[PDB]
Design a protein around this ligand. Structure first.
Ligand code: TGG
Ligand code: TGG
Lengths: 220, 215
Protein backbone atom coordinates (compact mmCIF):
# COMPACT_ATOMS: atom_id res chain seq x y z
CA UNK A 1 0.00 0.00 0.00
CA UNK A 2 0.99 3.59 -0.69
CA UNK A 3 0.91 4.33 3.04
CA UNK A 4 0.95 8.07 3.45
CA UNK A 5 2.88 8.33 6.68
CA UNK A 6 6.24 7.47 5.16
CA UNK A 7 9.09 9.58 6.57
CA UNK A 8 12.22 10.10 4.46
CA UNK A 9 15.86 10.34 5.46
CA UNK A 10 18.56 11.08 2.91
CA UNK A 11 22.18 10.11 3.46
CA UNK A 12 23.93 12.90 1.60
CA UNK A 13 27.25 14.71 1.25
CA UNK A 14 26.98 18.38 0.35
CA UNK A 15 28.88 18.15 -2.99
CA UNK A 16 28.14 14.58 -4.01
CA UNK A 17 26.63 14.83 -7.51
CA UNK A 18 24.95 11.46 -7.00
CA UNK A 19 23.23 12.69 -3.82
CA UNK A 20 22.38 16.05 -5.39
CA UNK A 21 20.31 14.29 -8.07
CA UNK A 22 18.10 12.84 -5.32
CA UNK A 23 17.92 16.18 -3.50
CA UNK A 24 16.58 17.60 -6.78
CA UNK A 25 13.90 14.89 -7.17
CA UNK A 26 12.81 15.47 -3.58
CA UNK A 27 12.72 19.28 -3.98
CA UNK A 28 10.88 19.16 -7.30
CA UNK A 29 8.23 16.83 -5.80
CA UNK A 30 7.94 19.11 -2.76
CA UNK A 31 8.84 16.30 -0.42
CA UNK A 32 10.14 16.93 3.07
CA UNK A 33 13.04 14.89 4.30
CA UNK A 34 15.66 14.58 7.04
CA UNK A 35 19.21 15.29 5.95
CA UNK A 36 21.76 12.79 7.31
CA UNK A 37 25.23 14.05 6.53
CA UNK A 38 27.94 11.61 5.49
CA UNK A 39 31.35 13.23 5.59
CA UNK A 40 33.05 11.63 2.64
CA UNK A 41 36.18 13.77 3.10
CA UNK A 42 36.59 12.56 6.69
CA UNK A 43 36.09 9.00 5.54
CA UNK A 44 38.66 9.40 2.73
CA UNK A 45 41.23 10.90 5.10
CA UNK A 46 40.59 8.26 7.83
CA UNK A 47 40.82 5.38 5.31
CA UNK A 48 44.11 6.77 3.92
CA UNK A 49 46.22 7.48 7.04
CA UNK A 50 44.95 4.03 8.02
CA UNK A 51 31.85 1.53 3.70
CA UNK A 52 29.21 4.22 3.56
CA UNK A 53 27.73 5.16 0.17
CA UNK A 54 25.72 8.10 -0.93
CA UNK A 55 22.88 8.51 -1.75
CA UNK A 56 20.79 6.24 0.40
CA UNK A 57 17.12 7.11 0.87
CA UNK A 58 15.82 5.59 4.10
CA UNK A 59 12.06 5.22 4.07
CA UNK A 60 10.36 4.56 7.39
CA UNK A 61 6.74 3.55 7.84
CA UNK A 62 5.37 2.11 11.09
CA UNK A 63 8.53 0.36 12.34
CA UNK A 64 9.52 -0.93 8.88
CA UNK A 65 12.65 0.60 7.34
CA UNK A 66 13.57 0.36 3.67
CA UNK A 67 16.98 1.46 2.43
CA UNK A 68 16.96 2.55 -1.19
CA UNK A 69 20.23 2.78 -3.08
CA UNK A 70 21.37 3.98 -6.54
CA UNK A 71 20.24 7.45 -7.53
CA UNK A 72 18.31 6.23 -10.59
CA UNK A 73 16.49 3.55 -8.64
CA UNK A 74 15.67 6.05 -5.90
CA UNK A 75 14.37 8.59 -8.41
CA UNK A 76 12.26 5.95 -10.23
CA UNK A 77 10.76 5.01 -6.82
CA UNK A 78 9.96 8.65 -6.07
CA UNK A 79 8.29 8.97 -9.48
CA UNK A 80 6.12 5.83 -8.91
CA UNK A 81 5.22 6.69 -5.33
CA UNK A 82 4.64 10.41 -5.89
CA UNK A 83 3.63 10.79 -9.50
CA UNK A 84 2.81 14.53 -9.45
CA UNK A 85 4.56 16.61 -10.45
CA UNK A 86 5.92 14.13 -12.98
CA UNK A 87 9.62 14.05 -13.70
CA UNK A 88 9.02 11.53 -16.54
CA UNK A 89 6.46 12.36 -19.22
CA UNK A 90 3.54 10.07 -19.91
CA UNK A 91 4.50 9.23 -23.49
CA UNK A 92 6.81 6.31 -23.89
CA UNK A 93 9.24 7.84 -26.43
CA UNK A 94 9.77 10.84 -24.17
CA UNK A 95 10.31 8.56 -21.17
CA UNK A 96 13.02 6.69 -23.12
CA UNK A 97 14.65 9.89 -24.15
CA UNK A 98 14.69 11.32 -20.64
CA UNK A 99 16.09 8.07 -19.22
CA UNK A 100 18.80 8.03 -21.88
CA UNK A 101 19.87 11.60 -21.02
CA UNK A 102 19.98 10.59 -17.34
CA UNK A 103 21.96 7.48 -18.14
CA UNK A 104 24.54 9.35 -20.17
CA UNK A 105 25.39 10.97 -16.86
CA UNK A 106 24.63 8.17 -14.45
CA UNK A 107 26.53 5.47 -16.35
CA UNK A 108 28.41 7.38 -19.04
CA UNK A 109 30.08 10.28 -17.26
CA UNK A 110 30.03 10.28 -13.45
CA UNK A 111 31.60 6.82 -12.92
CA UNK A 112 34.72 7.95 -14.79
CA UNK A 113 35.23 10.82 -12.36
CA UNK A 114 34.24 9.26 -9.06
CA UNK A 115 36.54 9.76 -6.14
CA UNK A 116 37.89 6.20 -6.01
CA UNK A 117 38.70 6.21 -9.74
CA UNK A 118 40.46 9.57 -9.46
CA UNK A 119 42.41 8.47 -6.35
CA UNK A 120 43.66 5.34 -8.13
CA UNK A 121 44.70 7.32 -11.21
CA UNK A 122 46.73 9.82 -9.28
CA UNK A 123 48.42 7.14 -7.16
CA UNK A 124 49.84 5.67 -10.40
CA UNK A 125 50.36 8.92 -12.31
CA UNK A 126 50.47 12.17 -10.30
CA UNK A 127 48.25 14.96 -11.71
CA UNK A 128 46.67 12.81 -14.39
CA UNK A 129 43.35 12.37 -12.52
CA UNK A 130 42.12 15.87 -13.34
CA UNK A 131 43.05 15.56 -17.01
CA UNK A 132 41.24 12.23 -17.10
CA UNK A 133 38.16 13.75 -15.44
CA UNK A 134 38.06 16.58 -17.95
CA UNK A 135 38.36 14.18 -20.89
CA UNK A 136 35.53 11.90 -19.75
CA UNK A 137 33.26 14.67 -18.59
CA UNK A 138 33.70 16.50 -21.89
CA UNK A 139 32.81 13.30 -23.77
CA UNK A 140 29.61 12.88 -21.78
CA UNK A 141 28.66 16.54 -22.11
CA UNK A 142 29.20 16.39 -25.90
CA UNK A 143 26.80 13.43 -26.13
CA UNK A 144 24.31 15.38 -24.03
CA UNK A 145 24.63 18.63 -25.94
CA UNK A 146 23.75 16.86 -29.21
CA UNK A 147 20.92 14.79 -27.72
CA UNK A 148 19.44 17.81 -25.90
CA UNK A 149 19.74 20.41 -28.67
CA UNK A 150 17.36 18.08 -30.54
CA UNK A 151 14.05 19.93 -30.41
CA UNK A 152 15.19 21.50 -27.14
CA UNK A 153 12.72 23.28 -24.86
CA UNK A 154 13.69 25.63 -22.07
CA UNK A 155 14.84 22.45 -20.16
CA UNK A 156 16.58 19.19 -21.14
CA UNK A 157 13.20 17.77 -22.31
CA UNK A 158 10.47 20.25 -23.08
CA UNK A 159 9.52 23.23 -21.04
CA UNK A 160 9.49 21.80 -17.53
CA UNK A 161 12.10 20.02 -15.39
CA UNK A 162 12.49 16.25 -15.68
CA UNK A 163 14.81 13.55 -14.42
CA UNK A 164 17.23 14.58 -17.17
CA UNK A 165 17.82 17.97 -15.50
CA UNK A 166 18.34 16.21 -12.12
CA UNK A 167 21.40 14.54 -13.67
CA UNK A 168 22.62 17.38 -15.93
CA UNK A 169 22.84 20.13 -13.30
CA UNK A 170 25.12 18.33 -10.83
CA UNK A 171 27.31 17.08 -13.68
CA UNK A 172 27.92 20.61 -14.96
CA UNK A 173 28.92 21.64 -11.43
CA UNK A 174 31.52 18.86 -11.42
CA UNK A 175 32.71 19.94 -14.87
CA UNK A 176 33.37 23.41 -13.45
CA UNK A 177 35.15 21.93 -10.47
CA UNK A 178 37.70 20.29 -12.78
CA UNK A 179 38.09 23.45 -14.87
CA UNK A 180 36.40 22.18 -17.98
CA UNK A 181 35.56 24.90 -20.45
CA UNK A 182 31.81 24.77 -21.07
CA UNK A 183 31.89 26.94 -24.18
CA UNK A 184 31.19 23.93 -26.48
CA UNK A 185 27.86 23.10 -24.78
CA UNK A 186 25.65 26.15 -25.25
CA UNK A 187 22.34 24.25 -24.99
CA UNK A 188 23.44 22.68 -21.71
CA UNK A 189 24.54 26.07 -20.35
CA UNK A 190 21.14 27.54 -21.25
CA UNK A 191 19.33 24.71 -19.50
CA UNK A 192 21.56 25.08 -16.45
CA UNK A 193 20.63 28.77 -16.24
CA UNK A 194 16.91 28.05 -16.50
CA UNK A 195 17.14 25.51 -13.73
CA UNK A 196 19.28 27.72 -11.51
CA UNK A 197 16.46 30.30 -11.27
CA UNK A 198 14.04 27.77 -9.76
CA UNK A 199 13.61 27.52 -6.00
CA UNK A 200 13.88 23.72 -5.88
CA UNK A 201 17.24 23.80 -7.69
CA UNK A 202 18.44 26.52 -5.33
CA UNK A 203 17.40 24.40 -2.34
CA UNK A 204 19.28 21.31 -3.50
CA UNK A 205 22.57 23.04 -4.42
CA UNK A 206 25.68 22.00 -2.47
CA UNK A 207 26.15 25.46 -0.93
CA UNK A 208 22.74 25.24 0.79
CA UNK A 209 23.27 21.86 2.43
CA UNK A 210 23.69 21.47 6.18
CA UNK A 211 27.24 20.05 5.86
CA UNK A 212 28.53 22.63 3.37
CA UNK A 213 31.86 24.18 4.47
CA UNK A 214 32.50 27.86 3.86
CA UNK A 215 34.26 28.69 0.60
CA UNK A 216 37.66 29.03 2.29
CA UNK A 217 37.55 25.50 3.71
CA UNK A 218 36.76 23.65 0.48
CA UNK A 219 39.23 21.49 -1.34
CA UNK A 220 39.27 21.86 -5.15
CA UNK B 1 -0.76 2.25 -40.28
CA UNK B 2 2.85 1.08 -40.05
CA UNK B 3 3.02 -1.40 -37.17
CA UNK B 4 6.06 -1.31 -34.88
CA UNK B 5 9.32 -2.82 -36.13
CA UNK B 6 12.53 -3.38 -34.12
CA UNK B 7 16.15 -3.29 -35.26
CA UNK B 8 19.05 -3.74 -32.80
CA UNK B 9 22.56 -2.41 -33.44
CA UNK B 10 24.72 -4.95 -31.61
CA UNK B 11 28.15 -6.52 -31.35
CA UNK B 12 28.24 -10.21 -30.43
CA UNK B 13 30.47 -9.89 -27.34
CA UNK B 14 29.30 -6.43 -26.09
CA UNK B 15 27.87 -6.84 -22.61
CA UNK B 16 25.76 -3.71 -23.02
CA UNK B 17 24.16 -5.05 -26.18
CA UNK B 18 23.68 -8.47 -24.68
CA UNK B 19 21.50 -6.96 -21.90
CA UNK B 20 19.05 -5.74 -24.53
CA UNK B 21 19.22 -9.00 -26.49
CA UNK B 22 18.10 -10.66 -23.22
CA UNK B 23 15.18 -8.28 -22.68
CA UNK B 24 14.04 -8.83 -26.28
CA UNK B 25 14.36 -12.63 -26.04
CA UNK B 26 12.63 -12.82 -22.65
CA UNK B 27 9.70 -10.88 -24.05
CA UNK B 28 9.52 -13.01 -27.20
CA UNK B 29 10.16 -10.02 -29.44
CA UNK B 30 11.67 -10.52 -32.90
CA UNK B 31 14.16 -7.97 -34.13
CA UNK B 32 16.52 -7.37 -37.02
CA UNK B 33 20.13 -7.81 -35.96
CA UNK B 34 22.43 -5.13 -37.30
CA UNK B 35 26.07 -5.94 -36.62
CA UNK B 36 28.50 -3.20 -35.75
CA UNK B 37 32.27 -3.62 -36.45
CA UNK B 38 33.09 -2.53 -32.95
CA UNK B 39 36.77 -3.45 -33.07
CA UNK B 40 37.35 -1.23 -36.12
CA UNK B 41 35.24 1.47 -34.53
CA UNK B 42 37.21 1.38 -31.30
CA UNK B 43 40.53 1.49 -33.13
CA UNK B 44 39.36 4.68 -34.85
CA UNK B 45 38.05 6.15 -31.61
CA UNK B 46 41.30 5.55 -29.84
CA UNK B 47 43.34 7.30 -32.55
CA UNK B 48 40.91 10.26 -32.57
CA UNK B 49 40.32 11.09 -28.93
CA UNK B 50 37.00 9.24 -29.05
CA UNK B 51 35.25 12.28 -30.60
CA UNK B 52 32.97 10.11 -32.87
CA UNK B 53 28.08 5.98 -31.50
CA UNK B 54 27.68 3.31 -28.70
CA UNK B 55 25.88 -0.02 -28.87
CA UNK B 56 23.21 -0.94 -28.07
CA UNK B 57 20.94 1.23 -30.16
CA UNK B 58 17.37 0.02 -30.64
CA UNK B 59 15.85 1.48 -33.79
CA UNK B 60 12.07 1.46 -33.62
CA UNK B 61 9.75 2.41 -36.51
CA UNK B 62 6.07 2.96 -35.97
CA UNK B 63 3.42 4.96 -37.86
CA UNK B 64 6.01 6.27 -40.31
CA UNK B 65 8.32 7.68 -37.62
CA UNK B 66 11.73 6.39 -36.53
CA UNK B 67 13.04 6.48 -32.98
CA UNK B 68 16.61 5.71 -32.00
CA UNK B 69 16.69 4.44 -28.42
CA UNK B 70 20.05 4.51 -26.66
CA UNK B 71 21.34 3.40 -23.23
CA UNK B 72 20.65 -0.18 -22.26
CA UNK B 73 18.69 0.69 -19.13
CA UNK B 74 16.48 3.22 -20.98
CA UNK B 75 15.85 0.71 -23.76
CA UNK B 76 14.98 -2.05 -21.27
CA UNK B 77 12.62 0.24 -19.36
CA UNK B 78 10.96 1.13 -22.69
CA UNK B 79 10.55 -2.56 -23.56
CA UNK B 80 8.97 -3.18 -20.13
CA UNK B 81 6.51 -0.26 -20.60
CA UNK B 82 5.74 -0.98 -24.28
CA UNK B 83 5.42 -4.74 -24.01
CA UNK B 84 4.53 -5.54 -20.36
CA UNK B 85 4.16 -9.31 -20.50
CA UNK B 86 6.13 -11.19 -19.55
CA UNK B 87 7.26 -8.73 -16.90
CA UNK B 88 10.90 -8.04 -16.24
CA UNK B 89 10.18 -5.84 -13.23
CA UNK B 90 8.18 -6.95 -10.17
CA UNK B 91 4.79 -5.42 -9.46
CA UNK B 92 5.57 -3.84 -6.11
CA UNK B 93 7.41 -0.56 -5.49
CA UNK B 94 10.04 -1.97 -3.13
CA UNK B 95 10.97 -4.87 -5.43
CA UNK B 96 11.17 -2.52 -8.44
CA UNK B 97 13.62 -0.28 -6.57
CA UNK B 98 15.68 -3.32 -5.55
CA UNK B 99 15.82 -4.70 -9.07
CA UNK B 100 16.75 -1.32 -10.53
CA UNK B 101 19.51 -0.93 -7.94
CA UNK B 102 20.95 -4.35 -8.81
CA UNK B 103 20.85 -3.48 -12.51
CA UNK B 104 22.52 -0.09 -11.83
CA UNK B 105 25.31 -1.71 -9.76
CA UNK B 106 26.38 -3.21 -13.09
CA UNK B 107 25.19 -0.48 -15.50
CA UNK B 108 26.82 2.42 -13.61
CA UNK B 109 28.99 0.67 -11.02
CA UNK B 110 30.96 -2.09 -12.80
CA UNK B 111 30.79 -2.00 -16.64
CA UNK B 112 31.95 1.61 -17.14
CA UNK B 113 35.21 0.77 -15.30
CA UNK B 114 35.96 -1.87 -17.95
CA UNK B 115 34.84 0.01 -21.06
CA UNK B 116 37.22 -0.40 -23.97
CA UNK B 117 38.00 3.35 -24.01
CA UNK B 118 38.72 3.52 -20.33
CA UNK B 119 41.04 0.50 -20.56
CA UNK B 120 42.77 1.86 -23.73
CA UNK B 121 43.49 5.18 -22.03
CA UNK B 122 44.96 3.40 -19.04
CA UNK B 123 47.01 1.13 -21.32
CA UNK B 124 48.41 4.11 -23.29
CA UNK B 125 49.73 5.74 -20.11
CA UNK B 126 50.94 2.53 -18.41
CA UNK B 127 50.96 -0.78 -20.32
CA UNK B 128 49.34 -3.59 -18.34
CA UNK B 129 47.46 -1.21 -16.00
CA UNK B 130 44.29 -1.99 -17.96
CA UNK B 131 44.23 -5.60 -16.77
CA UNK B 132 44.91 -4.72 -13.12
CA UNK B 133 42.23 -2.02 -13.18
CA UNK B 134 39.54 -4.10 -14.86
CA UNK B 135 40.15 -6.99 -12.47
CA UNK B 136 40.04 -4.72 -9.43
CA UNK B 137 36.87 -2.93 -10.45
CA UNK B 138 34.95 -5.95 -11.74
CA UNK B 139 35.79 -7.93 -8.59
CA UNK B 140 34.77 -4.96 -6.42
CA UNK B 141 31.44 -4.64 -8.24
CA UNK B 142 30.76 -8.34 -8.10
CA UNK B 143 31.56 -8.56 -4.40
CA UNK B 144 29.03 -5.79 -3.69
CA UNK B 145 26.54 -7.34 -6.05
CA UNK B 146 26.86 -10.75 -4.38
CA UNK B 147 25.88 -9.28 -1.02
CA UNK B 148 22.99 -7.37 -2.49
CA UNK B 149 21.66 -10.22 -4.59
CA UNK B 150 21.88 -12.74 -1.76
CA UNK B 151 19.46 -10.54 0.23
CA UNK B 152 16.36 -11.22 -1.90
CA UNK B 153 17.39 -13.83 -4.48
CA UNK B 154 15.20 -16.85 -5.09
CA UNK B 155 16.03 -19.01 -8.07
CA UNK B 156 16.97 -15.73 -9.84
CA UNK B 157 18.41 -12.39 -8.65
CA UNK B 158 15.03 -11.30 -7.42
CA UNK B 159 12.62 -14.02 -6.44
CA UNK B 160 11.73 -16.84 -8.74
CA UNK B 161 11.45 -15.28 -12.16
CA UNK B 162 14.00 -13.48 -14.34
CA UNK B 163 14.09 -9.73 -14.10
CA UNK B 164 16.13 -6.85 -15.45
CA UNK B 165 18.66 -7.64 -12.71
CA UNK B 166 19.55 -10.93 -14.36
CA UNK B 167 19.85 -9.20 -17.77
CA UNK B 168 22.69 -7.16 -16.26
CA UNK B 169 24.27 -9.93 -14.17
CA UNK B 170 24.77 -12.61 -16.80
CA UNK B 171 26.77 -10.52 -19.33
CA UNK B 172 28.88 -9.03 -16.58
CA UNK B 173 29.92 -12.49 -15.28
CA UNK B 174 30.96 -13.46 -18.84
CA UNK B 175 33.20 -10.39 -18.94
CA UNK B 176 34.67 -11.22 -15.52
CA UNK B 177 35.64 -14.62 -16.89
CA UNK B 178 37.32 -12.92 -19.89
CA UNK B 179 39.55 -11.00 -17.46
CA UNK B 180 40.46 -14.24 -15.68
CA UNK B 181 38.62 -13.48 -12.43
CA UNK B 182 37.81 -16.26 -10.02
CA UNK B 183 34.04 -16.41 -9.55
CA UNK B 184 34.17 -18.68 -6.54
CA UNK B 185 33.63 -15.72 -4.16
CA UNK B 186 30.18 -15.03 -5.65
CA UNK B 187 28.19 -18.21 -5.07
CA UNK B 188 24.77 -16.58 -5.29
CA UNK B 189 25.67 -14.86 -8.56
CA UNK B 190 26.91 -18.16 -9.93
CA UNK B 191 23.79 -20.11 -8.92
CA UNK B 192 21.60 -17.43 -10.56
CA UNK B 193 23.75 -17.45 -13.70
CA UNK B 194 23.33 -21.24 -13.93
CA UNK B 195 19.53 -20.96 -13.55
CA UNK B 196 19.44 -18.36 -16.32
CA UNK B 197 21.74 -20.34 -18.63
CA UNK B 198 19.20 -23.18 -18.72
CA UNK B 199 16.55 -20.91 -20.28
CA UNK B 200 16.00 -20.68 -24.02
CA UNK B 201 15.99 -16.88 -24.13
CA UNK B 202 19.35 -16.70 -22.42
CA UNK B 203 20.75 -19.27 -24.80
CA UNK B 204 19.47 -17.25 -27.77
CA UNK B 205 20.98 -13.97 -26.54
CA UNK B 206 24.46 -15.37 -25.79
CA UNK B 207 27.41 -13.96 -27.82
CA UNK B 208 28.13 -17.29 -29.51
CA UNK B 209 24.61 -17.41 -31.11
CA UNK B 210 24.80 -13.99 -32.72
CA UNK B 211 25.22 -13.53 -36.46
CA UNK B 212 28.52 -11.69 -36.04
CA UNK B 213 30.16 -14.27 -33.74
CA UNK B 214 33.33 -15.94 -35.15
CA UNK B 215 32.76 -19.32 -36.90
N1 TGG C 1 25.80 5.24 -9.61
C1 TGG C 1 25.73 5.62 -8.18
C2 TGG C 1 26.92 6.52 -7.85
C3 TGG C 1 27.19 6.63 -6.35
C4 TGG C 1 28.54 7.24 -6.04
O1 TGG C 1 29.42 7.30 -6.88
N2 TGG C 1 28.62 7.71 -4.80
C5 TGG C 1 29.79 8.36 -4.24
C6 TGG C 1 29.42 9.85 -4.03
S1 TGG C 1 29.52 10.82 -5.54
C7 TGG C 1 31.22 11.43 -5.50
C8 TGG C 1 31.64 12.07 -6.82
C9 TGG C 1 30.60 13.01 -7.40
O2 TGG C 1 30.36 14.15 -6.90
O3 TGG C 1 30.00 12.60 -8.44
C10 TGG C 1 32.24 10.34 -5.12
O4 TGG C 1 32.63 10.22 -3.93
O5 TGG C 1 32.68 9.55 -5.99
C11 TGG C 1 30.14 7.71 -2.94
O6 TGG C 1 29.26 7.44 -2.17
N3 TGG C 1 31.41 7.53 -2.64
C12 TGG C 1 31.82 7.00 -1.36
C13 TGG C 1 32.01 5.51 -1.35
O7 TGG C 1 31.67 4.83 -2.35
O8 TGG C 1 32.52 5.03 -0.31
C14 TGG C 1 24.43 6.37 -7.94
O9 TGG C 1 23.94 6.92 -8.90
O10 TGG C 1 23.91 6.37 -6.82
N1 TGG D 1 25.96 2.57 -20.35
C1 TGG D 1 25.90 2.23 -21.78
C2 TGG D 1 27.19 1.46 -22.11
C3 TGG D 1 27.46 1.31 -23.59
C4 TGG D 1 28.88 0.84 -23.93
O1 TGG D 1 29.79 0.92 -23.12
N2 TGG D 1 29.01 0.40 -25.20
C5 TGG D 1 30.28 -0.06 -25.77
C6 TGG D 1 30.20 -1.57 -26.01
S1 TGG D 1 30.24 -2.54 -24.51
C7 TGG D 1 32.01 -3.06 -24.56
C8 TGG D 1 32.53 -3.52 -23.23
C9 TGG D 1 31.51 -4.54 -22.70
O2 TGG D 1 31.48 -5.72 -23.16
O3 TGG D 1 30.92 -4.18 -21.67
C10 TGG D 1 33.09 -2.06 -25.06
O4 TGG D 1 33.63 -2.37 -26.14
O5 TGG D 1 33.49 -1.04 -24.42
C11 TGG D 1 30.49 0.71 -27.03
O6 TGG D 1 29.66 0.79 -27.90
N3 TGG D 1 31.70 1.25 -27.19
C12 TGG D 1 32.08 1.93 -28.42
C13 TGG D 1 32.15 3.43 -28.43
O7 TGG D 1 31.94 4.05 -27.39
O8 TGG D 1 32.40 4.00 -29.53
C14 TGG D 1 24.68 1.35 -22.01
O9 TGG D 1 24.28 0.65 -21.03
O10 TGG D 1 24.16 1.31 -23.15
Amino acid sequence: LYFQSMTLRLYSYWRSSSAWRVRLGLALKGLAYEYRAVDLLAQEQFQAAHMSQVPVLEVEEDGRTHLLVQSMAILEWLEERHPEPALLPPDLWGRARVRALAEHVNSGTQPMQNALVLRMLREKVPGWDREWARFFIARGLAALETAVRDGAGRFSHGDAPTLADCYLVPQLYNARRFGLDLEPYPTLRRVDEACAALAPFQAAHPDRQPDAPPPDRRTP
